[PDB]
Symmetry: C3
Subunit: 131 residues, 3 copies
Amino acid sequence: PLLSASIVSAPVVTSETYVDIPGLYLDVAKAGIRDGKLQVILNVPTPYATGNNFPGIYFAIATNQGVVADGCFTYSSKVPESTGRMPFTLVATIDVGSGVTFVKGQWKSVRGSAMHIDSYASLSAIWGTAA
Amino acid sequence: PLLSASIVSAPVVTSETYVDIPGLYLDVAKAGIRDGKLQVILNVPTPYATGNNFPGIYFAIATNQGVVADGCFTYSSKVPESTGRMPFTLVATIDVGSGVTFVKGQWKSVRGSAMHIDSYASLSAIWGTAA
Amino acid sequence: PLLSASIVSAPVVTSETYVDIPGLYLDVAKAGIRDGKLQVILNVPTPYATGNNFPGIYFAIATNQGVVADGCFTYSSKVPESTGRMPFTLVATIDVGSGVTFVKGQWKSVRGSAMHIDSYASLSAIWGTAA
Ligand SMILES: C[C@@H]1O[C@H](NC(=O)c2ccc(-c3cccc(CN)c3)o2)[C@@H](O)[C@H](O)[C@@H]1O
Ligand SMILES: C[C@@H]1O[C@H](NC(=O)c2ccc(-c3cccc(CN)c3)o2)[C@@H](O)[C@H](O)[C@@H]1O
Ligand SMILES: C[C@@H]1O[C@H](NC(=O)c2ccc(-c3cccc(CN)c3)o2)[C@@H](O)[C@H](O)[C@@H]1O
């Protein structure tokens, strides 16, 4: 009933759209889970953003149906003196009965920001069923 | 065994006391849960605070018995150049056997701050029983 | 199936190595859990760091086998005007079958920082077994 994927880095990218964070992927269908609920946690404890205009990163939890939940961090200065690490966690509960076969973490730039993961990050789920 | 409530906004308020975040409410009694433990996650991934004196927000998890756990974020400048988004997660485990009928997220101003949610936020619980 | 430990303070320390956060300890063996998986959440919602050189704190989840996962927060200024509270959550899933008898939260200084907890912090686990 516990699913988990974790990474320690990702190639630095920018994106104006949500794009997969490589490695943060849970295959629900492959685990034989076809109904009930998943409580999903995207945990990016040590990201940073680089950019010229109050940098930050949007993160999402997505399924094959798209983004279920999202949020961001942003710095409080236009060009931070140093881009500090800004812990980020997002939590969503999904109905698998809706047609879900996978869960992924995604990211999007804030204002053109380059997006950095260079240490542990995780995607976690707990499956709960009323049966 | 998985409970969830989520919002995308709340009216902007100030408060010197913990006050409910509208919509972040789980009715435990209504789910027929009267004993065991709940692991509760309050997830406010994208809040900001506005104010004149090192702004921030306190968040709590509360039951009908009151606040079980709380914490805050605060900015590192007196009047931030821009009030950046400051991800916030709080996690507490409650004994339902103690007399619990609901769980809520609450917020309180730091130093007079106006409190802002204008995107996804969640309250989640997993029920665990030794029986 | 739900384990939890929580604190409201810890003596202020520095460390160049990961050192236990007193009180954030889960005894897995004592609970008779010897296989399956644990989804562990370290939740430090209100820490701050004090120091002279872009302060911050590293946090880890560790077992008797060592650190499984870690991350940090850091400020974006060399000597913050005020050291604001920087919420921190870390999530990891552990195989108990690997030889695990306890789970702990740990911390390490960033750049010599003194490490501060003076309010609620938690260590949480959910045990999941395929049996
Ligand atoms: C952009 C700057 O990044 C610096 N950190 C690192 O360069 C770094 C390199 C490896 C790690 C790192 C992190 C978390 C867990 C671990 C352990 N695998 C390792 O951090 C910060 O100190 C600074 O404040 C800035 O944000
Ligand atoms: C106060 C400023 O707020 C800005 N963001 C927004 O005005 C905004 C409007 C909708 C959203 C928003 C957030 C997270 C997920 C989603 C998607 N539903 C949408 O953000 C920041 O960029 C800036 O750094 C400051 O903090
Ligand atoms: C270092 C400064 O610390 C200040 N907060 C406190 O001195 C304080 C003392 C007790 C608490 C505190 C926190 C969270 C939950 C609770 C409730 N038990 C209580 O905070 C900040 O306001 C400021 O921005 C700075 O970070």
